[PDB]
Amino acid sequence: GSTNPPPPETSNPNKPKRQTNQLQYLLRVVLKTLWKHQFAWPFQQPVDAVKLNLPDYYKIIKTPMDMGTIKKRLENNYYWNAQECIQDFNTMFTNCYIYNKPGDDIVLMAEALEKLFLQKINELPTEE
């Protein structure tokens, strides 16, 4: 039976990182807002292809991402800038759209969070 890959890295001493104000915002506004939402749960951790019985998941999805991972990265100050974080978010939503057919419960869930994600992003502060 097929196994899961290791999750994405959340700490990496080689990688350059910063704490910006835009990045403070990405956890305090953007992630807080999504994490609490009723449709967040499928995205709070890596997709478990073994227990969900999705042996094709990690054949089709080559760059997995999830909010648990993004959360741990924000907390460990893993990022250099806001765009890196923002990119993880768009990878998460996109992976969901790529794997699942449109109109699926899980797509609707990704769509809702995404909206919230964009409403909180649009008022990203100026780099201070």
Ligand X SMILES: Cc1noc2c1-c1sc(C)c(C)c1C(c1ccc(Cl)cc1)=N[C@H]2CC(N)=O
Helices 82-99 & 105-121 angle (0-180, nearest 10): 160
Number of residues that bind ligand X (CB under 6 A): 10
Report DSSP state, residue 37.
S
d(CA 120, CA 124): 7
Tokens of 28: 């305090």
* From candidates 96, 113, 114, 120, binder to ligand X by CB under 6 A: 96
* From candidates 4, 97, 100, 121, binder to ligand X by CB under 6 A: 100
Q: CB of residue 78 vs ligand X: minimum separation in angstroms? A: 21
Query: Which residues 56-95 are close enough to bind ligand X by CB under 6 A?
Result: none
Q: Which residue is nearest to ligand X (CB)?
A: 105
* From candidates 4, 35, 99, 111, binder to ligand X by CB under 6 A: 99
Range list of β-strands (E), the chain: none
Q: CB of residue 126 vs ligand X: minimum separation in angstroms? A: 33
Q: Among 2-10, 29-37, 68-76, 100-108, which window interacts with ligand X (CB under 6 A)?
A: 100-108
Tell me which residues touch ligand X (CB under 6 A): 42-43, 47, 52, 54, 96, 99-100, 105-106
